[PDB]
Amino acid sequence: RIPLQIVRAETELSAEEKAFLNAVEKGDYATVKQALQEAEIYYNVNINCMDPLGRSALLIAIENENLEIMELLLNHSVYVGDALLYAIRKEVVGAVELLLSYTQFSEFTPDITPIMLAAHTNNYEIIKLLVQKRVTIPRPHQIRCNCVECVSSSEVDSLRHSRSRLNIYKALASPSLIALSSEDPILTAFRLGWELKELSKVENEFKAEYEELSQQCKLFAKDLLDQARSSRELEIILNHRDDLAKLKVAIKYHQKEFVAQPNCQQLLATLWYDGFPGWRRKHWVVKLLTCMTIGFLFPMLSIAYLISPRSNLGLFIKKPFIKFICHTASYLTFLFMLLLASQDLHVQGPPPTVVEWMILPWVLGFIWGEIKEMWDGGFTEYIHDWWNLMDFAMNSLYLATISLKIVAYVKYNGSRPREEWEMWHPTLIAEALFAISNILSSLRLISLFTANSHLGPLQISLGRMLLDILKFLFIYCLVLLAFANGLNQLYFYYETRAIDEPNNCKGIRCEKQNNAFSTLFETLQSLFWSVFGLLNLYVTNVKARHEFTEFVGATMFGTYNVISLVVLLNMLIAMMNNSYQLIADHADIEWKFARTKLWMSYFDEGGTLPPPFNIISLIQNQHYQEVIRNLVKRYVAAMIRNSKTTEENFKELKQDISSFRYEVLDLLG
Amino acid sequence: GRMLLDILKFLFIYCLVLLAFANGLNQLYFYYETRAIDEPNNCKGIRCEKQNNAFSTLFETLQSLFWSVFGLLNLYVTNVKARHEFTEFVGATMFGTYNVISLVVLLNMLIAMMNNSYQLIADHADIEWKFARTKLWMSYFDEGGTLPPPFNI
Amino acid sequence: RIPLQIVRAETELSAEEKAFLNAVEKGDYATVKQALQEAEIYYNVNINCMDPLGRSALLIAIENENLEIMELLLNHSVYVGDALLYAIRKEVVGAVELLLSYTQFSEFTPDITPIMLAAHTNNYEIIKLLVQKRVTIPRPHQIRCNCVECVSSSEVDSLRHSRSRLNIYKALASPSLIALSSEDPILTAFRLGWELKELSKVENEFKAEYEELSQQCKLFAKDLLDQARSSRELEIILNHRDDLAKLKVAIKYHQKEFVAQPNCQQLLATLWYDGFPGWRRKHWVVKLLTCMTIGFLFPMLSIAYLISPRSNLGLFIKKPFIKFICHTASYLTFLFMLLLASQDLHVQGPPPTVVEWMILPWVLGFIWGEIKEMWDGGFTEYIHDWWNLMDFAMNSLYLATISLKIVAYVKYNGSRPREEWEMWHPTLIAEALFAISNILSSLRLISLFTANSHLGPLQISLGRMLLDILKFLFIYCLVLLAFANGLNQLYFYYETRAIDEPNNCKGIRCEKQNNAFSTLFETLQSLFWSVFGLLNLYVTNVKARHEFTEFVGATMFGTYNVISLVVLLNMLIAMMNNSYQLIADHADIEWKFARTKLWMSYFDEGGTLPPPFNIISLIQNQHYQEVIRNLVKRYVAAMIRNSKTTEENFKELKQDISSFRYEVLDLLG
Amino acid sequence: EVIRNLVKRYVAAMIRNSKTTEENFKELKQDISSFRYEVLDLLG
Amino acid sequence: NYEIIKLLVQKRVTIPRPHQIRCNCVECVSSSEVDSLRHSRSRLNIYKALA
Numbered sequence A, C: 001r002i003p004l005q006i007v008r009a010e011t012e013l014s015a016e017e018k019a020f021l022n023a024v025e026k027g028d029y030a031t032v033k034q035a036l037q038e039a040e041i042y043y044n045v046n047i048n049c050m051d052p053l054g055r056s057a058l059l060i061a062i063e064n065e066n067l068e069i070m071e072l073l074l075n076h077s078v079y080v081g082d083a084l085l086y087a088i089r090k091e092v093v094g095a096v097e098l099l100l101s102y103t104q105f106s107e108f109t110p111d112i113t114p115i116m117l118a119a120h121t122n123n124y125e126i127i128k129l130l131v132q133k134r135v136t137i138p139r140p141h142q143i144r145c146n147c148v149e150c151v152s153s154s155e156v157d158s159l160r161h162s163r164s165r166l167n168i169y170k171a172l173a174s175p176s177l178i179a180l181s182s183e184d185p186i187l188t189a190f191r192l193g194w195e196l197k198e199l200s201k202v203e204n205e206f207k208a209e210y211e212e213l214s215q216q217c218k219l220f221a222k223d224l225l226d227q228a229r230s231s232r233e234l235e236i237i238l239n240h241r242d243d244l245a246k247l248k249v250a251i252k253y254h255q256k257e258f259v260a261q262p263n264c265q266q267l268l269a270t271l272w273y274d275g276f277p278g279w280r281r282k283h284w285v286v287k288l289l290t291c292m293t294i295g296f297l298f299p300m301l302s303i304a305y306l307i308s309p310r311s312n313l314g315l316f317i318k319k320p321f322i323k324f325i326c327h328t329a330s331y332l333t334f335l336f337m338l339l340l341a342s343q344d345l346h347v348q349g350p351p352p353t354v355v356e357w358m359i360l361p362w363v364l365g366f367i368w369g370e371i372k373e374m375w376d377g378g379f380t381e382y383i384h385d386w387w388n389l390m391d392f393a394m395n396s397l398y399l400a401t402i403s404l405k406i407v408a409y410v411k412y413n414g415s416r417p418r419e420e421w422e423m424w425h426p427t428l429i430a431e432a433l434f435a436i437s438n439i440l441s442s443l444r445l446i447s448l449f450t451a452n453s454h455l456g457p458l459q460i461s462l463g464r465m466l467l468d469i470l471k472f473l474f475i476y477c478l479v480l481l482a483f484a485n486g487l488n489q490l491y492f493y494y495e496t497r498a499i500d501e502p503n504n505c506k507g508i509r510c511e512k513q514n515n516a517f518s519t520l521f522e523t524l525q526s527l528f529w530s531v532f533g534l535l536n537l538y539v540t541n542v543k544a545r546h547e548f549t550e551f552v553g554a555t556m557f558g559t560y561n562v563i564s565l566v567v568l569l570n571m572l573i574a575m576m577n578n579s580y581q582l583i584a585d586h587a588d589i590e591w592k593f594a595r596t597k598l599w600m601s602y603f604d605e606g607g608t609l610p611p612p613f614n615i616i617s618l619i620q621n622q623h624y625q626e627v628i629r630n631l632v633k634r635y636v637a638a639m640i641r642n643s644k645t646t647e648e649n650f651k652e653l654k655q656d657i658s659s660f661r662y663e664v665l666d667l668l669g
Numbered sequence B: 001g002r003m004l005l006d007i008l009k010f011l012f013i014y015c016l017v018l019l020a021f022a023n024g025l026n027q028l029y030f031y032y033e034t035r036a037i038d039e040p041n042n043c044k045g046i047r048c049e050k051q052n053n054a055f056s057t058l059f060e061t062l063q064s065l066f067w068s069v070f071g072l073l074n075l076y077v078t079n080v081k082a083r084h085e086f087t088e089f090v091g092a093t094m095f096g097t098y099n100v101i102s103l104v105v106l107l108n109m110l111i112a113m114m115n116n117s118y119q120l121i122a123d124h125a126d127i128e129w130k131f132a133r134t135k136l137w138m139s140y141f142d143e144g145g146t147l148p149p150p151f152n153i
Numbered sequence D: 001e002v003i004r005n006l007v008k009r010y011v012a013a014m015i016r017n018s019k020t021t022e023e024n025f026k027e028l029k030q031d032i033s034s035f036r037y038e039v040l041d042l043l044g
Numbered sequence E: 001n002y003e004i005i006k007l008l009v010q011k012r013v014t015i016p017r018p019h020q021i022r023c024n025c026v027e028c029v030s031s032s033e034v035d036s037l038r039h040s041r042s043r044l045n046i047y048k049a050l051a
C-alpha cells in the first residue's frame, strides 16, 4: 500500500472560520455581518483567514462579484493587499471602483502593477479608470542596450528581468492602452509591432510571445483602418505627415495587413489607373488590345515626354499604369533584340553588328538607371531589394562583355578560324559572358508576375519555397562532397590520358564517358549529372581486373544514388508540401503587399523614361486628430460589441440567486 | 531522422519484391549465361559499355534490378542470342512488372508515407531539436575530453 | 426603389390574441387563466390562434417547458394535434406524460409517429414511456423487394416512400430502442448495421444517411461490449450461440470496431499464445530465438503430430502461434528450395533433379490444402478471399509446369542444343511458367505482414491505395491506347525487315532500337517503356527524308511523355497522398481486424500440418440474457452521464424566472 | 401554393435550427436583479 | 431575423434598387468619384439586405 498524507502541511481553519467562509461563499449577507460584528467583540474568528485554495474572504467576495459583501468586508477593514489585482483580472468594474475608493502567496508576480495588469486584460473600462489618475509604465531600454543597469539586472536575475520586460511590452502593446494615451495610435502600433518583431528575433526564448504581441499590434492598426467610413477619412489617414506618406511608413514597417486593406487597395487602384476611369469594368479582349496598343506606342510616348512634357502625349506617360506598360514594352523589345542577336564568325574581335549597336543603348540605359536609383533611393534601401543583386550581376556581365569585345577588337586584326583559337581567347569569354547575361535578362521577367492576379501569389509561393530549397541544398551538398571525396580517393589511381581515349576526349561529356571519378572536380560533376541519370554505369569500370575495386566503387555510386534520389529528393518533396500548405493561407496578403510596392515604384517622377530614353501642417494635424478620434470611438464600440457577441458566469448566477434567496428568507421569516 | 524510420519500414517490402523478381528473372535467364571471352570487349556484367548477362546469376540479377530503379539498366539486356522470342517476351514482361511496381507503386507510396510522417512530426520539431541541442551542450560541460584530437593523446 | 410587401399573406392576430400569446410567452399564469375564463364567456379570443411563427399557445407552453400553463391550456380543451410530437422532439418528460394522459402546417412529415419520433430523438426515458404501451413500428420490406405494394408506392410517390423507409430505419437503428425491445441487442445491432450498409450500397441517394446509421449501430455494439467488467462476462458474450461463435458472427458482418475491442483483442491474444504464458513480457532477442528454434524444429513437430498426437510434442503443434510458426517455416523452406533450384541444359525434357523432386511434395501439398479448404469452408467464403486468386494462379501455373515437363520428357529423347530449339518448345514454356510461379510464390509472403505490429497497418495502407492505383490505371490506359493508335497509324508505312537491321534484331529490345512504332503491339510496348525512359529518341526517325513525318511523330511522342509523366503521374501522387491521409486514421482498426482473421484461421483443427506433411443451451441463453441485462443497464447509465456531461436552455431559464416573478408579484400585491 | 408550403416549412426549420453568448448571461443577471429590486421594494 | 423583417415589411418600406454591375450613368460615376468608399459600402449593404 502507498500511504497518502500531507507532505507540505499548512494551517487548517477552525470550525467557526470554515463556517464564516462558507457563509461568504454562499452570499448570505446577514450571517457574514453577524460574524464580523461578533468577531469585533469576541475575537473568535480571524477575518483574514485563507481557505484550502488560498483565497481569503475578500477574494471570495471578489470572485463571486458580490459587491455588497465586498463593501461590508471593506468597511470592517480586512486585509486588502493585491486584492485590486484580482479585481482587475476578474474584469469587474464595480470591484475595481470599490477598491480604488478604499510575503504572502500571490498569483501575480511582484513586478505586476494595477495599470500593467489592466493593460494585460485589455479591458477598456478599467484601463480608462486607471489612466484617469496619474499612472505611469516604466520605459523599456534599447533592444541591444548595454548600460550598467541592464547588465546588472540580467546577471543578478535573468528570469526576473526577462519576465518584467515581457510584462511591460504586454502592457504597452494593449490595443485599448494604445487607443488612449497615444498621440498617433497608428504610428505607435507600427513602431511597437516593429520593435516587438525585433525583440522576437533577438530573444531566442519567448519568441512566440513577442511574435503574437507584434501580430496583435498589426491587427490593431488594420482594424483602426477598417473603421474608416468615407474616402475623405481614408485619404486623410494615408496622407498624414508625422503623398501617401503614412502608407509609405506602413510599407517601411512591413505592415502587410494594413497595406492589403480593401479600401487602401481600392484607393491605390484608382491612383494606378489614372488615365482609364473605367478599367475595372472591361472585357478581357478590350484590356488586352489597349495594353498592346500602349506597348506598341511606347517610343512615341517617350519621345513626346522628351520633347514637350505638357501635352496630351507628353504627360500621358507619367500615369502609373501607362508608365508600367511602356517600361515593360521597352524591356520586351530589348529581349526581342537579344533573341535576334543570334540569327562571318572567323574574325577575331569583329566590329559590333547592327543588332549589337541597337542593344548597346539599352545596356547603357540599364546601367544609368541602376546608378540613378542607387543615388536617389540610398544604399540600405537599394541593398535590401534582392532583385537588385541580379541587376548588378547582369550589368557587371554586360560591362565585362563590352570590355572583352573592345580588347578583342584592338588586340586582334587577322581572321583565324575558331578551331585553332586559344581556349581563353577574349572573343570566346566575351560570348560566354554575353550568353549568361542573356539568360539572366530573360529570367528577370519573373518580377513582373507581381502585376498579375493569377501569377502574383504563385510567385510569392515559389519564392517562399525557395527558402526550403536552400535549406535542403546544404545537407545535399554535404552528402555530395562526402561521396565525391570517397569516389575520388578510390578511383584516382586509374586516371588515363586523353590520348588513350578512343576519340581523344577525356571526361564525362564524351560519347563514351571516361575518367568520371579521376579528379575531385570531375567526380563532383559526375555525381551531379548522376542525379539526372546522364552518367552511365560503365564509368565505374577500370581497365585493370580489379573486380573488388570496381564493386566497391559501384557500391559507393549506388549508395549515393539511393541517398540523393530515394531519400533526399522525397524529403525535399515533403518539405515543399508542408511549406506550401503553410504559406497558402497568407498568399493573398503577401501578393497584395508586393503588388502595392510595385505600384508605388511607378508613382515617382524619377525614372519615368524607360531605357534607352533615360540617357538622352497644423490644420493637417488637426484633421488627422479628428479622424483618429472618430476611428478610436468606432473601434472601441466595435470591439466591445464583438467581445459581448465560462464556469465563472454560472458561479456568479448561482451567487446572485443565493443572495436573493437569503435576502427574501430574512425579510419574510 | 524521424522520416528515416518510415524509409526503413518501406525498405522491407521493397526488398521482398526485389528478391521475388530477382529469383524469377534468374530462374528464367540462367540458361543463357555466356563466358566473358564471348563478350565483345572481354567484359561480363552490367558495368560494361554494352551490358550483358544482366540476369545470369542471382547476385548479378539483384544488381541489375537495383540499377533499373535509377534507369541505368538498358532494355536490350532482356534479349538472348537464341531466337526464343517467347522467353525474351516473358523476361521483358517480368522486368516491366518489376519497374511498374518499384517505381509507379512503391515509390509513390513511399512519398505519401513521408508526407504523412513529416506533417505529423512538424508540430514537435522544436521541442525535439531543443532536447537534442541540450544533450549536445551538456556533452561539452564535462572536464573530460577537453582537448580535441590529436591533442588528446 | 424596391417595394417590399407580403406576397404570401396570412391571417393577422387581433390585439387581444397578441396580448394573450405574449402573456403565454412570458409565463404569467394569472393573466392566461383570466384570458381563458373570459374567452369562455365573451368568445373574444381564439385560444387556438397561431403566431407569426406558426406556434399556438400550447406549442409556446411546450417550447418554454411551462408545465403549469401546459396543464391549464389542456384543462380548457385547446387543440392538441401533433403537440405530442413537439413535446417528444423537445425531449421534455413532463410534457410527454401530460399529453399521454390527456390539414394545418406541421414541422413533422405525415408518416412520423410518436414512437418513431422518440426513437429518432434516442431519448431513453420517452422511448421507454412509449414502449410501456402497445406501440408498433411497421416492418420495412426487403432491400430488393419486388412485391406489388412496393412498386405501387414507388411509382405513385417515390419521395414519400423513400422518406418513410428512411424514417423507419432511423427509428429501428436507435440505440435506446435496441437496448429495449430486443432479445439480443448485439446480434440485432450487427444485422441492422449490415442491412443499413446494403441499403447505402443500393440507394445511390441517401447514401450518407444510411452509412451514418450503420456506423451508429456498429458503435452501439462496440459500446455494449465496452461495458463488460470481467473476463467471465466477455467469454459469455463472445461464446454465445444464437467456440467464439458471436466473435465469428461479428467477423462475418464486418464489425471491425467490435472485433478490435481491447478486451476482445486481449482474450484473442491469450488464446493465440497458448503455449507461452509470458510472451507479453519478453525481450526481442528471446522472442526471436524462440521463433527461430520453433521454425527449425517444425519437421519434428509435424512428424510428432503424425505419429502420436497425444504427447508433449504431438499436440504442441495444435497451438495457434506454434502452428503459424511451423507453417511459415515450411513456406520459407519451400522458397529456399525454389532459390536453390536455379544453381546439363541441352537435354530436351530432362528428368527432374533432386531439388525438383524435393519441390514436388510441397506443390502437391499446396494443391491438396487448397482443395481441402475449398471443400471444408465452402464456395462463397473461398471466392471472397482475394489472396485465394493468387493461390489459384500459382497452383495452375505449377500444374501447367508439371504437365509440360512430362510432355517434354515423353516427346523428346535427344540432346539438341538450346540455340536451335523451337520458339514454342515445351521446355522453354515450362521454364517460363515455373519462373512466373516462383515470382508469385515469393510475392505471396505479403499476406504474412498482417501478423506483425509494424508491418500490418502499412500493408493495410498499401492495399487501400491499390484501389486509387486501379482507378488511375483506367485513364492512363485510355491515353496510352490513343497515342499508340496515332503513332502506329503514322509509322506503320516505314516498317523494315529484320534482315535490314544491323544485327538481324528487330524491335526495341535490340542494342540499337528500331521499328518502335511499326505495329500496334510494338507501339504499345514502346510507349510503355518510354514511361521509364528506356526508349531512345532516335526511334522517331525514319530512313526516308520525311522531316515533317518525323517531326509529327516526335511531337506525338513528346505529348505522350508530357501527359503520362508530368500530368498523370503527379495526379496519381496527389491521389495517393489524399487517400493515405484519409486511411491513416483507421489503419489500426483495419489491421487488428485483419490480424484477428489471421489468428482465427489458425484456431481450427483442419490444416494443422503444413505442406508437405498434409498429404502423408437453455442455461447458456439465461447466462447471456443476464450478462446482456447488466451491459444494457451500464450502457444506458454511461450514455446518460456522457450526454449530461443551447439557446433553448437560456429561454427556459428566463421562462422560469419570469413565472416566479409573476407569482411573487401576484401573491404580494 | 407549393412555394407557400415550402416557405412555411423552411422558416420553421431554420428557426428550429437557430434555437437548437455573454449577452445571454447579462440578460439573466438583469432579470434576476430586477426581480430582486421589485421584491425588496414590495416587502420593505 | 424573420420576426423583425416581417414586422418592418408590414409597413410600407422600400430598399433602393442597385444599378447595373457595369452601369455608366452620371449618378454612378459622380458617386464613385465623390466618395468611392461610401458608394461601395452602400452597394454592399443593399446587396446584403436583398440576399
Ligand SMILES: CC(C)CCC[C@@H](C)[C@H]1CC[C@H]2[C@@H]3CC=C4C[C@@H](OC(=O)CCC(=O)O)CC[C@]4(C)[C@H]3CC[C@]12C
Residues within 6 Å of the ligand: A291, A328, A445, A448, A449, A450, A451, A452, A453, A455
Ligand atoms: C510564356 C513565354 C511565351 C514567355 C513570355 C514572356 C513575356 C511575353 C511574358 C512573361 C511575363 C508576362 C507579363 C506578366 C505580368 C504582366 C501583368 C499584366 O497585368 C495584369 O495581369 C493585370 C492588369 C494590370 O497589370 O494592372 C500585364 C502584362 C504583363 C506585364 C505580362 C506581359 C507579358 C509577359 C512579359
Ligand SMILES: CC(C)CCC[C@@H](C)[C@H]1CC[C@H]2[C@@H]3CC=C4C[C@@H](OC(=O)CCC(=O)O)CC[C@]4(C)[C@H]3CC[C@]12C
Residues within 6 Å of the ligand: B012, B013, B015, B016, B019, C291, C328, C445, C448, C449, C450, C451, C452, C453, C455
Ligand atoms: C526482406 C527480405 C530479406 C525478404 C525476407 C523474407 C522473409 C524472410 C520475411 C518476409 C516477411 C517476414 C515475416 C513477416 C511477418 C512475421 C510476423 C512475426 O510476428 C511478429 O512480428 C509479432 C509476433 C507474432 O507473430 O505474434 C513473425 C515473423 C514473420 C512471419 C516474418 C518472418 C520473416 C519473413 C517471412
Ligand SMILES: Clc1ccc(Cn2c(CN3CCCC3)nc3ccccc32)cc1
Residues within 6 Å of the ligand: A327, A328, A331, A365, A366, A367, A368, A369, A370, A391, A392, A394, A395, A398, A441, A444, A445, A447, A448, A610, A611
Ligand atoms: Cl541587364 C539589366 C540591368 C538592370 C535591370 C533592371 N531594370 C529593369 C528590369 N525591369 C523591366 C521589366 C522587368 C524588370 N528595368 C530598368 C530600368 C532602368 C534601370 C534598371 C532596370 C534589368 C536588366
Ligand SMILES: Clc1ccc(Cn2c(CN3CCCC3)nc3ccccc32)cc1
Residues within 6 Å of the ligand: C327, C328, C331, C365, C366, C367, C368, C369, C370, C391, C392, C394, C395, C398, C441, C444, C445, C447, C448, C610, C611
Ligand atoms: Cl504455389 C502456392 C499455392 C497456395 C498457397 C497458399 N498456401 C499457403 C501460403 N501461406 C504460407 C505463408 C504465406 C501464406 N500455405 C498453404 C498451406 C496449404 C495450402 C495452401 C497454402 C501458396 C503457394
Ligand SMILES: [Ca+2]
Residues within 6 Å of the ligand: A370, A373, A387, A388, A391
Ligand atoms: Ca533595379
Ligand SMILES: [Ca+2]
Residues within 6 Å of the ligand: C370, C373, C387, C388, C391
Ligand atoms: Ca489459401
Ligand SMILES: [Zn+2]
Residues within 6 Å of the ligand: A141, A142, A145, A146, A147, A148, A149, A150, A151
Ligand atoms: Zn539599459
Ligand SMILES: [Zn+2]
Residues within 6 Å of the ligand: C141, C142, C145, C146, C147, C148, C149, C150, C151
Ligand atoms: Zn414489398
Ligand SMILES: [Zn+2]
Residues within 6 Å of the ligand: E019, E020, E023, E024, E025, E026, E027, E028, E029
Ligand atoms: Zn447608374
